[PDB]
Amino acid sequence: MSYNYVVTAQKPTAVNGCVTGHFTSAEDLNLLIAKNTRLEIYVVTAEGLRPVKEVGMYGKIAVMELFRPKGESKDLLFILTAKYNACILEYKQSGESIDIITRAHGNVQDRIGRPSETGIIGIIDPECRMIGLRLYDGLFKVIPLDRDNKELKAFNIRLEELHVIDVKFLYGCQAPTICFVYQDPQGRHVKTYEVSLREKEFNKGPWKQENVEAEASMVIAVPEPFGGAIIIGQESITYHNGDKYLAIAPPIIKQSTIVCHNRVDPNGSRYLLGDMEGRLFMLLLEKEEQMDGTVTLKDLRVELLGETSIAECLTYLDNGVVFVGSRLGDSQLVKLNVDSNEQGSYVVAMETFTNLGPIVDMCVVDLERQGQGQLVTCSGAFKEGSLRIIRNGIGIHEHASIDLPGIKGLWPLRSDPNRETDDTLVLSFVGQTRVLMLNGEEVEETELMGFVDDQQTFFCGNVAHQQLIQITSASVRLVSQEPKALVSEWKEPQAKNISVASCNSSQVVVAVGRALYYLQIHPQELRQISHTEMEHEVACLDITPLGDSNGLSPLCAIGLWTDISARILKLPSFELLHKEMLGGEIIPRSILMTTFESSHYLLCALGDGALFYFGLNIETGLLSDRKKVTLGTQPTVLRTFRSLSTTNVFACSDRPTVIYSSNHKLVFSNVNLKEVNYMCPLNSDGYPDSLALANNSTLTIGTIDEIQKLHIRTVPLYESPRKICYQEVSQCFGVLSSRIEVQDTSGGTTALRPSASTQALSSSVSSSKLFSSSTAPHETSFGEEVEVHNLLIIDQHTFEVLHAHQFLQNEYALSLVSCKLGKDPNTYFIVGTAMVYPEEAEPKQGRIVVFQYSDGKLQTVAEKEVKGAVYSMVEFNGKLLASINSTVRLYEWTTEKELRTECNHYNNIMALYLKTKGDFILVGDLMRSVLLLAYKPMEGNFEEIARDFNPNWMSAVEILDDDNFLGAENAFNLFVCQKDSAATTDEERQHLQEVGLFHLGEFVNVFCHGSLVMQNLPTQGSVLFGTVNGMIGLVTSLSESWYNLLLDMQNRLNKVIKSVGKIEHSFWRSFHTERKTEPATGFIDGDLIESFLDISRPKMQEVVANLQYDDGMKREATADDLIKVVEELTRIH
Amino acid sequence: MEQAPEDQGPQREPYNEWTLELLEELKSEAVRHFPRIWLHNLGQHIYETYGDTWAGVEAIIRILQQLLFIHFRI
Amino acid sequence: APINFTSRLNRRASFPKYGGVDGGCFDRHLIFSRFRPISVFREANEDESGFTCCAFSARERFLMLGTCTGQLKLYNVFSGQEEASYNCHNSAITHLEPSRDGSLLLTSATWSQPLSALWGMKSVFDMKHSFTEDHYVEFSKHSQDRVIGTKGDIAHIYDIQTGNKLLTLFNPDLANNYKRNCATFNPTDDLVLNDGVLWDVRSAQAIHKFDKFNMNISGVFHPNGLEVIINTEIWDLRTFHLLHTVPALDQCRVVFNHTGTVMYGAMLQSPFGSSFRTFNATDYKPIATIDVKRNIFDLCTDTKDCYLAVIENQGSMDALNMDTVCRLYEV
Amino acid sequence: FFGESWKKHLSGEFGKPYFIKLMGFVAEERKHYTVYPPPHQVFTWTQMCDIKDVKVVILGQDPYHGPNQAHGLCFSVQRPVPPPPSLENIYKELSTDIEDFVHPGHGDLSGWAKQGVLLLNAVLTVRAHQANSHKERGWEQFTDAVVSWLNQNSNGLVFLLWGSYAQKKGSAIDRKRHHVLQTAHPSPLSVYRGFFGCRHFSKTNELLQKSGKKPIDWKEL
């Protein structure tokens, strides 16, 4: 009886992998990024990096590789998922409509066999002869590349070798030769096989197999004129090619393990090598002219270029422009200067890209306060490790907040025509207008000669030929900039008053109900051009010029009375171009034709707070794709504004919204404000690139945030973050850390760089003894890398390191909690640690330390020694519940300010996860699924209520309610267990039925309750999660009726939506562990349901076919019926 | 899930008549691997400890029946 | 990759899956080196228990046990209760193989003719068919539609519906005379390993004779369908090249786990072990040797890598004082 | 309820220091364990026919250790107690030896006793479930004496000694004054084939005719 809904609140932000080649066209240098389930396509411009298309995948992108098969226009892309879905995709765009076609597809999983625990290796032959796959051990799967392989069928070659480190297809050979480094008892070696496609077997094998040093990790196929292969893996670089052998052991590379590489220069000459420390090097192949006519390799050079983000993969993009693709931290753009820096660093930072991955820990707070839920994360690892503060919506930074009530309009001006900085602000009122002078950062009242102040303003602002303009209730005024004096005045033929007006730099459009006048802008004159007599009165009109440089608008938007028709007109024609019937009786209020990405659109607001957006046809004048977005309750006012060379729209309602495009799809990210009646973009001297905002009372001027669905504040730590808590009382955060120091000659260890743990205001060190130590040693070392664990005290607002407490040598901090315990009124910061020794395989010792951030220091309150690692801790109603290896201890807090052991539970292998719900406890084990305990107060101990026996390797757990519990497993699944306390037999009662099943595709680390939406009152429940790829998600509860409805809708939706690689959603989301592969049940993919709004309207009607809902009372469904259903669901995250 | 079948197999049957017959089928099969002097000697043992009961019958049918099993497994 | 699990686990969220390299190998080297006995199953109302075979119900609710007296009892795993008793053979149940689906069940005895049978496991417990002269019977590994009976050095193949003999695999010249020979089906069903001679089921033709180095052990197929394991020597099924010599694997009743990740060895020749080995399947490195401290008679495991049933003789292997109970382990 | 004909004869034993110890043991044994057969039943072998009227004698070992089973005669079990294995085995010999014999459908050998067949056990009492329990205690010495008197006093008896133990009790009897008939023990535990096919019952009746005594109607039970 559990029914749950699952939606991604935040897409994965980690670079799983990236390639350069020519994908969109053979001229374009494309950059492609794998962000697990998402594929990001970009064009490498002189300017930087242009977005193109981003597309989701019914799988985890296992192998991404661009290849140009003989007989192809542009490079094709091969994709393989972790679920084994192979496919060849082709980029194809019909001008504006961008679509990714599946050139072929199939599931390459071997019916029987266990996949190599090392991971998938995907390699293509330079000639495009076949796709080499190492999926399963002792087998080399070969996908032939011949035309008729639409079903992507492969075969295997028994690869005697087993446990292959890395294999690359070799350059400069007739026979498709594979060169690989393989591990065998005798040590690591390099070997060569030819791949006979005809005989479906291998053949010896260019040069004889040579031996390579045991730390050989990468095999780089060197292209011709060089040939052969380079074998990276510190402390040596080697070149193997027939009988030629070069070996370079540079002193430099020695310190760190090189992880990725990129060919700078195609001929082989220049190569970029990046390591786990974020160092960037240059591997330089000395092209030797040798003799006649043979091109040999003279020597190899290794030079250091400086430091970048920890690179998961580097990608050079020409002009010393390299993209440092980081999974472990912020991805970046790097410049390589021809000459050395002051420091000696050729690396020049260009741009940085947000990367919440890996989301180690999470928590939900209310820092600004009142109903606004904000998330804080432990994101990144090593130098790249930071803290991220995710806020829902886009907030405005005020700089001016004047007191004006009942403001009916705001407009910016340039009083002096010499300056580019704004100096004026015009404010419309019911029956009046007022002028504001902005002499620097000081704003005072003025009057601008030639402006009527005894009438209401409809439009104001500077126009062409060094002149200003005003449109009033009565007349339209023209003012000369030098000197200030009226130059023209437009009168209505029969002295009638202007109802609604619009303007640009050269055109004016005014309305007198059914009368519609068009005026032009000339030096010292208001030249009237035309006039049309409608059906009814006009509610709104717009003349914003879009494209290309002309300054003039070729068309005019129109809103009419009673009928409710959003009509388009041609300028100066006044010809009824396109009429969209919206119907009803509710009147439109504000229309605006605007350009996003590069594409044109039209917008329309209604008196009920409902918007309509269409596709504005370039020169045509048609309205394609009628969509509906329900916003406010009050009518909406629409205005354009520039933020970092981007023209976005601001929709003024009781529900303020910022309209913008992302991936050519219209976004409606909200504003962190009460209600805006009128907006204005203001770029002054004192207030530059800010914006004026007014409502029912109080005018404010300020700068808007970076326009995104969620706002992320980064706090760099220069070390690894681990766990977070919030001591509301102490107005701070408690963070766990880890820095690396290397065992030097002089003393023990020396640190690598300065980190948040060293750069603290108040520093501390753990003076504790407990562990003798030695017994038990502790070899040490001698050039070994050691971890240094610290607890950090972070300020609620400055986020500076108020205090850092360093733990013992070889000590790891694993779990912290902030809470009030027992009869104690003090709020404590409690940490669980472990004594980690590299030699040993499991820690047999650790400690629970209690702290309190009183005043400005971190004091050691209480300490308890444990015989294992404290994997987790919970606030269990005055008590502290703790996980120590194979035990679940309930610690009672005493008067003596100490930890006493109340009761224990042992039926777990390695109990790594803990959750509470009053008397119930949920335990998540290393391999044995979940288990449910309940403290029997009168008995004074735990009672196992039910267990799950399934061998599910846990990632995270969570209590949904007293009878339903959710878990995350290492094979990227979600599951929900039910408790049937009612069942006929004990055997059944003591059993947790896996009622919910779902393959999520993400590795869940953190599961915490609450929402980011401003809660004040469709679905009942809220669980947020954080993954390794930096994805942020949400799980919520559904009723039987709604589940049954949304499930029918999923099965309906699945038919309609086109997959990338033709992958079945039912399969993709089907529960998948080594063992079971069962259809996902009791779960609703929110991400698929939320795609219903995105899709086509006929495709929406295709959904409702004969959709009947019992909400024993049959009510019929239409496309509009459902749009509202989904509309609720989108507002839930 | 779940439920066990219905025993509509072998049934006993008219026991004692059967028990007696199984003992003498087994007694011979035992004799083809074990010296008939040791096997008798095991019978008395059983007889002194159990008596002329059926309970004692089944317990040579068990002892015999087990030896043969180990023998088979070697 | 790290050795210390806590460090491995810290790298597991980094860095997933299994933290660094070799998983996983460490995780299985930790997990399958650990076994807690959680319950015993004593025979009905007899003062002395006489189990000879252990096997789980297909759905694994009951753990099915064979008596020495030729019976079969299904004990409810959770409850403990003997839910039901069925009279199978007239001699000591040596083998039990529940049809994956749980419609059928195979049985082997000690000396009573018939030595093997197929029984209805659904609603009514009937005898379906008998294999009289076959001392060991095993189901076809694919979708179990055939039965692979052995008769010493000779193999046999039967249809579960008809109950009729189809093939008789034997070549007296290629034969090795492996004492405890057992003809087994390949993971794909198309091959048979019998008396150290690998055969082709469809052609009914011999493929290879894996040179004699052992005297009792016939061997099994690895579930990769790539290798074959004749006692120690690990051979390749297509190449016949020796791959590795696992000296720890000598004289072992080997049985892979459900996922085919860990091997369970049972040392034999009182005969059989008091202990059992486990190894990592991926690279034949031993994991542990567990001294059950009691003479084991059989050993089985569930799909869930949760329970380990073992038939342990409670008290010295004297004709009289023989009490074969069934013990249960956790992991 | 000892039988007067035998009481006026065996009586001399009661006074013996072996018999006093045996009675006192049996006494204290019933004060602590349930001993079979119960008092009146211990001596039914005597109260069935007169010591003089006995023609045939069969030697048993131990009583039946189950409730309401043990009744005074060897290989005899009360109604509705099913026959013990040896009896089921002995009955099976009667069908392959005596013409008009049917399975009597019960285990009660009252019939043979009234008719002149002595069904005397070496041991006369046992603890419930404890097999030989009251073993080398006294009982054997008393029955050894009962046996001695029939050898020394009565003439032309048919001694049916089945199995090594009973055979050893009869070693003292001469095949020249009496008729000693010996074979293996009826019990199916034997391993040693013997009793099956011996025709001891027909032989009893043939030898009765040579003596001129009334034959045994084996069918009367």
Side-chain angles (χ1 to χ4, degrees), chain B residues 36-55:
Chain B
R36 358 165 92 268
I37 351 121
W38 182 97
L39 297 156
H40 169 239
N41 272 160
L42 256 218
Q44 279 161 305
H45 206 275
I46 295 158
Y47 195 56
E48 277 75 277
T49 50
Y50 278 113
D52 192 59
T53 178
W54 293 105

mmCIF file of all heavy atoms in Angstrom, chain B residues 36-55:
data_model
loop_
_atom_site.group_PDB
_atom_site.id
_atom_site.type_symbol
_atom_site.label_atom_id
_atom_site.label_comp_id
_atom_site.label_asym_id
_atom_site.label_seq_id
_atom_site.Cartn_x
_atom_site.Cartn_y
_atom_site.Cartn_z
ATOM 1 N N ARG B 36 29.627 -60.237 8.094
ATOM 2 C CA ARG B 36 28.397 -60.630 8.731
ATOM 3 C C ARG B 36 28.500 -60.960 10.153
ATOM 4 O O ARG B 36 27.529 -61.275 10.700
ATOM 5 C CB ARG B 36 27.823 -61.851 8.016
ATOM 6 C CG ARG B 36 28.605 -62.372 6.771
ATOM 7 C CD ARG B 36 28.249 -63.741 6.307
ATOM 8 N NE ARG B 36 27.213 -63.772 5.308
ATOM 9 C CZ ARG B 36 25.942 -63.894 5.602
ATOM 10 N NH1 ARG B 36 25.566 -63.910 6.871
ATOM 11 N NH2 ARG B 36 25.048 -63.962 4.635
ATOM 12 N N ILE B 37 29.694 -60.945 10.717
ATOM 13 C CA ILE B 37 30.007 -61.139 12.090
ATOM 14 C C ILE B 37 29.975 -59.928 12.883
ATOM 15 O O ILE B 37 29.621 -60.043 13.989
ATOM 16 C CB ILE B 37 31.400 -61.701 12.387
ATOM 17 C CG1 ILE B 37 32.167 -62.157 11.178
ATOM 18 C CG2 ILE B 37 31.325 -62.887 13.298
ATOM 19 C CD1 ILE B 37 33.492 -61.458 10.985
ATOM 20 N N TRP B 38 30.463 -58.802 12.372
ATOM 21 C CA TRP B 38 30.332 -57.428 12.871
ATOM 22 C C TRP B 38 28.885 -56.912 12.860
ATOM 23 O O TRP B 38 28.456 -56.283 13.833
ATOM 24 C CB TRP B 38 31.243 -56.501 12.064
ATOM 25 C CG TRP B 38 31.262 -55.046 12.471
ATOM 26 C CD1 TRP B 38 32.182 -54.436 13.278
ATOM 27 C CD2 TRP B 38 30.458 -53.995 11.925
ATOM 28 N NE1 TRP B 38 31.979 -53.076 13.293
ATOM 29 C CE2 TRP B 38 30.934 -52.776 12.465
ATOM 30 C CE3 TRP B 38 29.377 -53.961 11.029
ATOM 31 C CZ2 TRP B 38 30.350 -51.543 12.160
ATOM 32 C CZ3 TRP B 38 28.806 -52.735 10.721
ATOM 33 C CH2 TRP B 38 29.292 -51.546 11.281
ATOM 34 N N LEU B 39 28.140 -57.189 11.767
ATOM 35 C CA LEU B 39 26.743 -56.767 11.585
ATOM 36 C C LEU B 39 25.764 -57.442 12.551
ATOM 37 O O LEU B 39 24.745 -56.864 12.925
ATOM 38 C CB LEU B 39 26.289 -57.005 10.148
ATOM 39 C CG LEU B 39 27.003 -56.245 9.067
ATOM 40 C CD1 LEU B 39 26.872 -56.969 7.791
ATOM 41 C CD2 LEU B 39 26.438 -54.852 8.908
ATOM 42 N N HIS B 40 26.041 -58.684 12.907
ATOM 43 C CA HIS B 40 25.200 -59.396 13.843
ATOM 44 C C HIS B 40 25.454 -58.763 15.202
ATOM 45 O O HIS B 40 24.504 -58.467 15.922
ATOM 46 C CB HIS B 40 25.564 -60.871 13.827
ATOM 47 C CG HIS B 40 24.944 -61.654 14.929
ATOM 48 N ND1 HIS B 40 25.718 -62.352 15.851
ATOM 49 C CD2 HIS B 40 23.637 -61.820 15.237
ATOM 50 C CE1 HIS B 40 24.855 -62.954 16.659
ATOM 51 N NE2 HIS B 40 23.589 -62.660 16.331
ATOM 52 N N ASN B 41 26.738 -58.574 15.452
ATOM 53 C CA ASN B 41 27.207 -58.134 16.692
ATOM 54 C C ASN B 41 26.644 -56.849 16.978
ATOM 55 O O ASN B 41 26.622 -56.517 18.078
ATOM 56 C CB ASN B 41 28.673 -57.942 16.644
ATOM 57 C CG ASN B 41 29.486 -59.197 16.971
ATOM 58 O OD1 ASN B 41 30.640 -59.266 16.618
ATOM 59 N ND2 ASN B 41 28.925 -60.136 17.682
ATOM 60 N N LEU B 42 26.253 -56.074 15.974
ATOM 61 C CA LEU B 42 25.625 -54.722 16.093
ATOM 62 C C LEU B 42 24.192 -54.865 16.363
ATOM 63 O O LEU B 42 23.652 -54.088 16.966
ATOM 64 C CB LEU B 42 25.538 -54.068 14.774
ATOM 65 C CG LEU B 42 26.229 -53.004 14.032
ATOM 66 C CD1 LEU B 42 25.218 -52.195 13.219
ATOM 67 C CD2 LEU B 42 26.842 -52.287 15.159
ATOM 68 N N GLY B 43 23.545 -55.797 15.706
ATOM 69 C CA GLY B 43 22.192 -56.218 16.053
ATOM 70 C C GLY B 43 22.066 -56.498 17.531
ATOM 71 O O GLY B 43 21.207 -55.901 18.198
ATOM 72 N N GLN B 44 22.799 -57.352 18.196
ATOM 73 C CA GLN B 44 22.533 -57.534 19.661
ATOM 74 C C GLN B 44 22.571 -56.288 20.418
ATOM 75 O O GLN B 44 21.651 -55.977 21.050
ATOM 76 C CB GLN B 44 23.499 -58.422 20.282
ATOM 77 C CG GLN B 44 23.185 -59.850 20.079
ATOM 78 C CD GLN B 44 24.362 -60.755 20.300
ATOM 79 O OE1 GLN B 44 25.382 -60.575 19.696
ATOM 80 N NE2 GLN B 44 24.220 -61.741 21.172
ATOM 81 N N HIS B 45 23.645 -55.572 20.363
ATOM 82 C CA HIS B 45 23.772 -54.220 20.871
ATOM 83 C C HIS B 45 22.537 -53.451 20.811
ATOM 84 O O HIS B 45 22.036 -52.872 21.651
ATOM 85 C CB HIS B 45 24.705 -53.482 19.947
ATOM 86 C CG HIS B 45 25.412 -52.344 20.580
ATOM 87 N ND1 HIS B 45 24.870 -51.094 20.685
ATOM 88 C CD2 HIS B 45 26.624 -52.269 21.150
ATOM 89 C CE1 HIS B 45 25.708 -50.299 21.310
ATOM 90 N NE2 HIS B 45 26.782 -50.992 21.601
ATOM 91 N N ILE B 46 22.041 -53.415 19.685
ATOM 92 C CA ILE B 46 20.739 -52.739 19.492
ATOM 93 C C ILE B 46 19.622 -53.402 20.320
ATOM 94 O O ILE B 46 18.829 -52.711 20.980
ATOM 95 C CB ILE B 46 20.378 -52.539 17.979
ATOM 96 C CG1 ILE B 46 21.385 -51.588 17.319
ATOM 97 C CG2 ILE B 46 18.949 -51.991 17.792
ATOM 98 C CD1 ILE B 46 21.475 -51.700 15.945
ATOM 99 N N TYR B 47 19.613 -54.745 20.315
ATOM 100 C CA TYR B 47 18.644 -55.525 21.057
ATOM 101 C C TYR B 47 18.727 -55.353 22.546
ATOM 102 O O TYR B 47 17.684 -55.323 23.189
ATOM 103 C CB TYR B 47 18.722 -56.986 20.684
ATOM 104 C CG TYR B 47 17.531 -57.798 21.127
ATOM 105 C CD1 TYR B 47 16.241 -57.447 20.741
ATOM 106 C CD2 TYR B 47 17.700 -58.991 21.821
ATOM 107 C CE1 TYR B 47 15.140 -58.232 21.088
ATOM 108 C CE2 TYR B 47 16.606 -59.784 22.178
ATOM 109 C CZ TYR B 47 15.323 -59.394 21.823
ATOM 110 O OH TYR B 47 14.243 -60.179 22.176
ATOM 111 N N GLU B 48 19.941 -55.245 23.108
ATOM 112 C CA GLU B 48 20.074 -55.059 24.552
ATOM 113 C C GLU B 48 19.648 -53.687 24.963
ATOM 114 O O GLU B 48 19.102 -53.520 26.046
ATOM 115 C CB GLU B 48 21.499 -55.308 25.034
ATOM 116 C CG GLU B 48 21.797 -56.771 25.262
ATOM 117 C CD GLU B 48 21.979 -57.533 23.966
ATOM 118 O OE1 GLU B 48 20.950 -57.933 23.369
ATOM 119 O OE2 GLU B 48 23.139 -57.654 23.503
ATOM 120 N N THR B 49 19.892 -52.705 24.107
ATOM 121 C CA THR B 49 19.615 -51.307 24.402
ATOM 122 C C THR B 49 18.182 -50.897 24.110
ATOM 123 O O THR B 49 17.636 -50.020 24.806
ATOM 124 C CB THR B 49 20.618 -50.439 23.660
ATOM 125 O OG1 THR B 49 20.622 -50.862 22.299
ATOM 126 C CG2 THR B 49 22.036 -50.534 24.252
ATOM 127 N N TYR B 50 17.566 -51.535 23.096
ATOM 128 C CA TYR B 50 16.206 -51.201 22.704
ATOM 129 C C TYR B 50 15.128 -52.175 23.126
ATOM 130 O O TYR B 50 14.052 -51.728 23.548
ATOM 131 C CB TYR B 50 16.130 -50.928 21.199
ATOM 132 C CG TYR B 50 16.548 -49.525 20.849
ATOM 133 C CD1 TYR B 50 17.695 -49.284 20.114
ATOM 134 C CD2 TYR B 50 15.799 -48.431 21.267
ATOM 135 C CE1 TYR B 50 18.118 -47.980 19.838
ATOM 136 C CE2 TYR B 50 16.217 -47.126 21.016
ATOM 137 C CZ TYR B 50 17.374 -46.904 20.293
ATOM 138 O OH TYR B 50 17.734 -45.605 20.018
ATOM 139 N N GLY B 51 15.414 -53.476 22.950
ATOM 140 C CA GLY B 51 14.492 -54.580 23.196
ATOM 141 C C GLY B 51 13.672 -54.967 21.974
ATOM 142 O O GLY B 51 13.712 -54.299 20.937
ATOM 143 N N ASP B 52 12.890 -56.041 22.093
ATOM 144 C CA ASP B 52 12.025 -56.524 21.014
ATOM 145 C C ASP B 52 10.870 -55.531 20.751
ATOM 146 O O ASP B 52 9.673 -55.866 20.843
ATOM 147 C CB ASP B 52 11.526 -57.956 21.309
ATOM 148 C CG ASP B 52 10.875 -58.648 20.130
ATOM 149 O OD1 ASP B 52 11.552 -58.815 19.091
ATOM 150 O OD2 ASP B 52 9.705 -59.060 20.261
ATOM 151 N N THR B 53 11.262 -54.290 20.463
ATOM 152 C CA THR B 53 10.343 -53.232 20.127
ATOM 153 C C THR B 53 10.579 -52.882 18.700
ATOM 154 O O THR B 53 11.645 -53.166 18.145
ATOM 155 C CB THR B 53 10.504 -52.001 21.036
ATOM 156 O OG1 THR B 53 9.583 -50.986 20.593
ATOM 157 C CG2 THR B 53 11.952 -51.453 21.091
ATOM 158 N N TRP B 54 9.604 -52.204 18.135
ATOM 159 C CA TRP B 54 9.683 -51.699 16.789
ATOM 160 C C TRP B 54 10.634 -50.516 16.735
ATOM 161 O O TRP B 54 11.341 -50.334 15.740
ATOM 162 C CB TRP B 54 8.286 -51.317 16.324
ATOM 163 C CG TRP B 54 7.407 -52.515 16.192
ATOM 164 C CD1 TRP B 54 6.402 -52.899 17.029
ATOM 165 C CD2 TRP B 54 7.538 -53.544 15.221
ATOM 166 N NE1 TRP B 54 5.856 -54.078 16.597
ATOM 167 C CE2 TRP B 54 6.550 -54.507 15.498
ATOM 168 C CE3 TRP B 54 8.382 -53.730 14.120
ATOM 169 C CZ2 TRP B 54 6.398 -55.654 14.727
ATOM 170 C CZ3 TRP B 54 8.240 -54.865 13.362
ATOM 171 C CH2 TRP B 54 7.254 -55.810 13.662
ATOM 172 N N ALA B 55 10.680 -49.749 17.843
ATOM 173 C CA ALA B 55 11.565 -48.605 18.021
ATOM 174 C C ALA B 55 13.002 -49.050 17.790
ATOM 175 O O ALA B 55 13.756 -48.399 17.060
ATOM 176 C CB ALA B 55 11.397 -48.046 19.417
#
